[PDB]
Ligand SMILES: N[C@@H](Cn1c(=O)n(Cc2ccsc2C(=O)O)c(=O)c2cscc21)C(=O)O
């Protein structure tokens with residue numbers, strides 16, 4: 001409706017959403033910059049909606065209580081306190097049962113963060129061996145995937161990183177990067193994050209194809225009239241190659257040898 | 258409830274099961290897509306009859322804007338689902354409803370092993386090694402419409418000389434890679450299926466132009482959300498990974 005302004009829930013995450021810096025006072029949506037803002041601007045332009053960006057108040061993506069209770073941007077959608085979530089919000093089984101997702105505007109998975117010029121080319125290569133230690137941030141989506149996987153190779157990798165846990169499982173992504181940087185360690189991690197780090201640590205590389213295929217989708221409340229239009233606009237933008245440039249724009253470092 | 262599912266003959270998604278005796282109905286077919294179908298059938302609780310798309314097309318538009326293929330069968334409500342490697346695309350999604358992708362892919366390179374070529378850029382910066390795509394296919398289209406300069410450069414190369422670098426179809430392209438110093442740009446799934454069966458070939462570089470296959474339904478279908486969710490379940494159960502490995506794995510390339 002022409003009257004209505006859509007509330008867009010989102011979350012602070014480099015480089016999707018960041019407070020912008022400026023020599024002049026900023027207001028409203030203008031206070032933010034980033035990939036997700038560009039995406040939003042493009043979607044708004046195509047669909048004709050006006051929007052109002054609000055950080056999710058608990059600052060979480062959206063997970064479920066041991067007691068079936070949701071938080072994060074997911075909870076905002078369920079309660080119709082937001083019309084859209086535009087953020088690196090992973091499409092998953094549990095989430096898709098409580099809210100509606102547009103098709104992925106970004107497609108990703110788990111990948112390997114490691115050094116250059118080694119025989120290592122895949123998870124399989126990692127799994128087939130023990131001399132180079134590999135792992136994940138403790139209790140991350142990446143680690144959770146391995147823990148829960150019924151796929152032989154991954155089952156083997158989990159046994160590995162759980163067996164060496166004090167070593168193999170790191171506190172957070174920062175410490176994990178340092179491990180790769182400081183040790184003969186390979187870090188499994190959400191591919192997009194790996195790609196960001198790679199553009200800024202010239203002696204790091206992203207190894208292998210993508211494991212655990214998944215996408216980021218714009219979240220909507222079940223039944224939302226906008227979801228379908230948003231899928232179409234996303235595809236339009238992929239068609240025009242515009243998503244690739246947006247990715248490029250916000251992921252690019254300042255050069256790498 | 259019984260659903261009509263349109264699909265299309267395609268290795269290794271849909272194939273004639275080989276048997277000494279006569280086979281009937283759904284039992285005639287096997288492949289990655291019949292496995293997915295059975296698997297979504299069990300989660301959603303539906304019966305289905307597999308119907309090969311009569312014109313044997315995926316689905317595209319005339320200059321009039323008339324559709325064909327499985328896409329047309331959906332628009333006309335002659336199928337309830339299309340379960341096949343149907344690429345989710347902008348123009349298709351305007352006329353049919355897609356589930357979220359059960360397989361993600363992109364464009365990659367098909368070449369021989371043991372050369373220094375590691376990327377499209379390595380191919381682009383050079384002329385001894387010929388490279389191309391199938392004429393009029395999605396790969397060519399992508400390359401033709403691309404504003405990325407490396408790709409613009411590759412495109413000018415491919416299309417030069419009455420397009421001697423293009424080929425009529427992927428079988429011809431495959432053979433050309435096999436018998437000639439020639440690299441083939443193509444849909445990565447088919448590339449992987451080929452490398453599994455030609456030990457001296459490989460995929461060069463990574464994926465470009467990300468995209469995915471979804472189960473098509475007619476606009477407004479109640480099955481779309483239910484299949485999306487079944488697809489996510491199967492992904493998390495790791496069943497998609499197993500289905501993929503089952504049908505893609507060759508006989509070992511030692
Ligand atoms: N997409 C996620 C949020 N999310 C996310 O989980 N991770 C993964 C992660 C974060 C700390 S450890 C860890 C791991 O994978 O081991 C991201 O890297 C990320 C970048 S943008 C949004 C992200 C979501 O929808 O919940």
Ligand SMILES: N[C@@H](Cn1c(=O)n(Cc2ccsc2C(=O)O)c(=O)c2cscc21)C(=O)O
Nearest residue numbers: 315342343344391394395396397443444447
């Ligand atoms: N997904 C497509 C159908 N389709 C497809 O286009 N290609 C690629 C291709 C075929 C001839 S040229 C060409 C190219 O990449 O240049 C496939 O390899 C494929 C494997 S299963 C379904 C497939 C569709 O929805 O129309």
Ligand SMILES: [Cl-]
Nearest residue numbers: 137172173174
């Ligand atoms: Cl962290």
